Design a binder for this molecule. Structure first.
Ligand SMILES: [Mg+2]
Length: 211
């Protein structure tokens, strides 16, 4: 299925702080995310324009009386396009057990144990028989604040790389041009510095420096 999102970079930590402060009345939830990535040493998926990710996540306001495991989501993102602050990608995703996700980080060959349609599709589309030639590329931490604002769900990200923090606003929408205009009008009125995001979080990670 096609995932479509507005993607804007917040230019400073100060801009990000101003935004999260102003959006506090609209807060829905806060997610702590760890993103991990998988490819061959020869970058076979990356060269075929595919990204294979395991995301581990927890809701920051999870019940203290009723603990639950972190969630683990496997995703395949294919044929991405990112321009003019709009991201479009073919995406397949599935939830998997936390313990198996953790084991796949250390041993990518164990991705075959899951029996996921997502991973089945990786094998079928790109001509892999298994995940024996795969490594975990490592990954990074993201704090995602989610807001219900003017008919849309806003995601405000603080991505914490080894080389520094990056700040973004995202919005998953079937009407990206209309929604981008609405977000930008708000940011402009509030003087919150921004530009189009020209790189995915994974691309920034791989580059090893701030965009
Ligand atoms: Mg995104």
């Amino acid at each position: 299925a096609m995932e479509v999102e507005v993607k804007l970079r917040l230019l400073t930590a100060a801009a990000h702080l101003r935004l999260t402060t102003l959006l506090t009345p609209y807060h829905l939830k806060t997610l702590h995310q760890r993103n991990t990535f998988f490819d061959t040493p020869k970058n076979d998926l990356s060269l075929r324009r595919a990204v294979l990710r395991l995301r581990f996540l927890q809701n920051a306001a999870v019940s203290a009386a009723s603990p639950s495991p972190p969630r683990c989501i496997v995703s395949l993102k294919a044929k991405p396009t990112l321009a003019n602050g709009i991201s479009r990608v073919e995406e397949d995703e599935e939830e998997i057990e936390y313990w198996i996700g953790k084991e796949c980080v250390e041993s990518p060959a164990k991705l075959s144990d899951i029996g996921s349609r997502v991973l089945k599709r990786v094998k079928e589309e790109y001509g892999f028989n298994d995940f024996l030639g795969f490594v975990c590329l490592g990954g990074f931490e993201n704090v995602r604040n989610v807001y219900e604002w003017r008919g849309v769900k806003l995601e405000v990200d603080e991505t914490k790389y080894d080389f520094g923090n990056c700040y973004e606003i995202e919005c998953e929408t079937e009407e990206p041009e209309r929604v981008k205009t609405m977000i930008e009008e708000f940011l402009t009125e509030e003087k919150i510095e921004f530009s189009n995001s020209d790189m995915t979080k994974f691309a920034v990670f791989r580059s090893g420096k701030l965009p």
